[PDB]
């Protein structure tokens, strides 16, 4: 009756009447290799007895290219393997991760294990509802599903992308307000394995570009409103297959910040460029996955570096798209490897290493802390790494090119970090935030305000600054990524309310100076917890109020108000021992507000502020006024350009 | 995609005299990740299949006599024979593995 025994035949035979040869197809082969419900679904989806005129119309609706342009191909090398030595390890079932030597990840792991780690969730694409029905046959794809679902107000193209080890699919569902759809599909991958088309289309006609390995397919109907059809797919394939991995990531990054340049990282009328950018992202992920898949033993260091690059790409893309979603990826074995590798780095060892082995460990931390589980030992390591690079920086007060990348890595490590348990670790992190806000000077702020105004040649991976980790709040065509990167720590600064009792609105707060057992709030407005200090020199239109609240939620120990500027020449270039330490120094001007802040931790610092190459002691104006602060809630003004 | 313009294609030097063989790839075979030179040198004298001589344009292959020595980096390479022997006579090739493999031309040594 039903399907269970309808196949009493031994096999199915395909026959050609004009040729005296018989073709065969053993029935059990289809039943085992592909599932029975998939087989019946495939037969039903074919529309076997559909009228020829309907298939003709479906043929005319599509748009076809000129020819399958073939190029020398094979691209570049995205692959990295072990450097011809014995550091390779085969994780059998649960091989103990404490047996992995070293603290730099120079060893190698199984490539197939990490492959299954990236692709671990099955999917059933080309469902009965989606317009993938008419184009593609239904298929089961285990992949990392993306999503850029952008709206629902009769706008909102659903760009549900897919990244598999063999192919990349991306779609441009125009849900609109009716049943009809404009399903602009883009495919990229091995031409041999691809989602089979219906009877009204073929790859031999639709393959826009070809390589020795990779083919790009553009299955997009013509009658629909697609201005995107006026572009050279050959140029896209050249830009996507011939550049080095670093150049490809750079081009994706610059395209994304260009989308930021206009309102396209939030709007709808620029849907096709977002669609193409998402496609480029998916094929970059596919290229990385294929490069890892090519070998069988892969180096953890290079893998983690590539993962950090892809992570940063996903972060910036989510920074445009709040709705950006990425599901189905489970970096479990790599996470355990990184955890047990970085559980053997003491806080001193991390600071002692050179700035080429401080990036690898922190990339492992990034990989292992997607959930906010960074160990406190690594938090102290970050603390004294920032201390070391601060002491290096305090000599000439210029910033290089390895330290900014390292600082970006620690920024994204701390951003996706949950609050720790020990209060001392939180205090140390708060100290390092103070060190970063002392790092962000007027010149550095000028570099950022002038630098991000030109996204055409911008590259975030090198355009970083300590202001993207500092406690300064005065962030005030052009890219709007300043606050977009500031919020990644501002909303997740361990215990976000550094202020505890006098809860005041954070609208006109310029600075927070969190010294040990005292907190300073610099704002043009004022709090109501205790007395404040106000500058008498207010002849211009500005307000500068500073309050000193205790972390123990208590008022001032002394009620004396200044309301004046004490002028004295005291405390010149200090003596030996430790006269000034664990303190901060302000710098403000009557024409710009707050200029800079400085934190001192060791003798080298206060010996080093008084250099001619320091940002301070410059002749911009006749009148600059410094401030003296220490960790007991008193303000004494310093006058004198010595 | 990347080809080797191997020159000179026919050179002759006396016994024991330093022999210089060049190889020029179109674009760089230098991999910026490993900071290595992906290129190899092979010797074929007619009759039996070729034999490997150089691993990464610097590293010396296993079982090779010590006279040969790789050099160069990027788009310039050289298989310098410290001393040329009677049994040394053969032809040579250079290949890459950065992109798809693409062997070079030919260069046969000769004895005056």
């Amino acid at each position, epitope marked *: 009756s039903a399907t269970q025994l309808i196949n009493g035949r031994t096999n199915l035979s395909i026959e050609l009447e004009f040729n005296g040869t018989s073709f065969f197809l053993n029935w059990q082969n289809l039943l085992n290799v592909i599932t029975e419900p998939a087989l019946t679904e495939l037969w039903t989806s074919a529309e076997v007895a559909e009228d020829l005129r309907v298939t003709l119309k479906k043929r005319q609706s599509l748009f076809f290219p000129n020819k399958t342009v073939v190029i020398s191909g094979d691209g570049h090398r995205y692959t990295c393997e072990v450097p011809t030595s014995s550091q390779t390890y085969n994780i059998t079932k649960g091989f103990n991760y404490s047996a992995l030597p070293g603290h730099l990840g120079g060893f190698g792991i199984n490539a197939r294990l990490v492959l299954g780690d990236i692709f671990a969730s099955k999917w059933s694409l080309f469902a009965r509802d989606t317009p993938e029905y008419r184009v593609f046959y239904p298929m089961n794809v285990m992949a990392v599903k993306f999503s850029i679902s952008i709206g629902n107000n009769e706008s909102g193209v659903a760009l549900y992308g897919v990244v598999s080890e063999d192919f990349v699919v991306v779609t441009l569902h125009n849900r609109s307000k009716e049943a009809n759809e404009t399903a602009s599909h883009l495919l990229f991958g091995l031409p041999d394995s691809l989602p089979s088309l219906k009877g009204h289309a073929t790859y031999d006609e639709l393959t826009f570009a070809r390589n*020795a*390995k990779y083919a790009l397919v553009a299955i997009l109907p013509k009658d629909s409103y697609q201005t995107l059809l006026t572009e050279n797919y050959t140029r896209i394939f050249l830009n996507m297959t011939e550049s080095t991995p670093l150049e490809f990531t750079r081009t994706i990054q610059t395209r994304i910040v260009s989308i930021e340049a206009r309102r396209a990282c939030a709007a709808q009328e620029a849907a096709p460029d977002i669609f193409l950018v998402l496609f480029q992202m998916l094929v970059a992920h596919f290229l990385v996955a294929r490069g890892i898949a090519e070998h069988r033993f892969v180096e953890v260091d290079c893998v983690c570096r590539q993962y950090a690059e892809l992570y940063f790409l996903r972060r910036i893309s989510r920074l445009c798209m709040p709705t950006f979603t990425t599901v189905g990826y489970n970096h479990t074995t790599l996470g355990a490897v990184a955890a047990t590798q970085i559980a053997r780095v003491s806080a001193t060892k991390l600071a002692s290493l050179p700035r080429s082995s401080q990036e690898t460990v922190l990339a492992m931390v990034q990989l292992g802390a997607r959930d906010g589980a960074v160990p406190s030992s690594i938090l102290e390591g970050i603390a004294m790494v920032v201390e070391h690079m601060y002491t290096a920086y305090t000599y000439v007060y210029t910033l290089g090119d390895t330290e900014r990348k390292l600082m970006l890595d620690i920024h994204t490590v701390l951003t996706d970090s949950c609050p720790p348990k020990d209060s001392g670790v939180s205090e140390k992190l708060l100290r390092t935030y103070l060190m970063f806000t002392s790092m962000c000077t007027n010149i550095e702020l000028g570099e950022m305000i002038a630098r991000f105004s030109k996204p055409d040649s911008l590259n975030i991976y090198r355009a970083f600054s300590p202001c993207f980790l500092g406690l300064r709040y005065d962030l005030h065509g052009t890219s709007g990524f300043a606050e977009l990167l500031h919020a990644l720590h501002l909303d997740s600064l361990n215990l976000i309310p550094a202020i505890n009792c006098s809860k005041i609105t954070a609208d006109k707060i310029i600075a927070t100076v969190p010294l040990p057992h005292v907190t300073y709030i610099i704002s043009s407005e004022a709090l109501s917890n205790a007395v404040v200090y106000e500058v008498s020199e207010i002849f211009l239109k500005s307000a500068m109020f500073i309050s000193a609240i205790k972390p123990d939620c208590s008022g001032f120990n002394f009620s004396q108000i200044d309301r004046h500027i004490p002028i004295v020449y005291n405390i010149s270039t200090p003596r030996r021992g430790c006269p000034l330490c664990d303190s901060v120094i302000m710098s403000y001007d009557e024409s710009d507000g707050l200029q800079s802040l400085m934190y001192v931790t060791n003798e080298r610092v206060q010996t080093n502020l008084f250099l001619d190459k320091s940002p301070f002691f410059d002749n911009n104006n006749l009148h600059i006024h410094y401030l003296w602060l220490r960790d007991n809630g008193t303000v004494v003004e310093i006058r004198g350009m010595y | 995609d990347i080809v080797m313009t191997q020159s000179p294609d026919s050179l002759s030097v006396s016994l024991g005299e330093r022999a210089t063989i060049n190889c020029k790839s179109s674009q760089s075979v230098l991999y910026s990740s490993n900071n290595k030179n992906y290129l190899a040198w092979y010797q074929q004298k007619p009759g039996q*299949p070729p*034999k490997l001589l150089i691993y990464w344009a610097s590293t010396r292959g296993s079982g090779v006599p010590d006279r040969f020595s790789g050099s160069g980096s990027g788009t310039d390479f050289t298989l310098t024979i410290s001393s040329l022997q009677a049994e040394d006579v053969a032809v040579y090739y250079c290949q890459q593995y950065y992109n798809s493999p693409r*062997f070079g031309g030919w260069t046969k040594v000769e004895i005056k």
Partner: nanobody, 121 residues
Framework: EVQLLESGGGVVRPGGSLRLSCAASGFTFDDYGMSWVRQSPGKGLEWVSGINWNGGSLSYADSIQGRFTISRDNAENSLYLQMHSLRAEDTALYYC??????????????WGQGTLVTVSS
């Protein structure tokens, strides 16, 4: 050491099919991939196709892209190459290598004895 021996050589008709079957031994087949390199008597050497350690990612030449299918099974020690609609100038001395590492292509460390095919009439 490791010796690679090919089989199936002979003379074929223009526009046909033929099986090249290299039979590797003496080493762990799975870890290292293999490749094919033809030796036209006038010229000296040219690479043809390449298969990785497991057989998923396959690399192919340019002028012959599409006509060739390389198939290598990890379990039984064998590497096979099929050519379809081969032209007249595809005559050479075909060699199977022992590509170092796990990628589809790399420096080749042992080369086979070799068998030659020809397209004649």
């Amino acid at each position: 050491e490791v010796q690679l021996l090919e089989s199936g050589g002979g003379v074929v008709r223009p526009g046909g099919s033929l099986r090249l079957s290299c039979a590797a031994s003496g080493f762990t087949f799975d870890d290292y991939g293999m490749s094919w390199v033809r030796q036209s008597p006038g010229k000296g050497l040219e690479w043809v196709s390449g298969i990785n350690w497991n057989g998923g990612s396959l690399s192919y030449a340019d002028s012959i892209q599409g006509r060739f299918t390389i198939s290598r099974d990890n379990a039984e020690n064998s590497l096979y190459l099929q050519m379809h609609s081969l032209r007249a100038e595809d005559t050479a001395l075909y060699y199977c290598a022992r590509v170092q590492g796990s990628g589809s292509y790399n420096n080749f460390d042992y080369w086979g004895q070799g068998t030659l095919v020809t397209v004649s009439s």
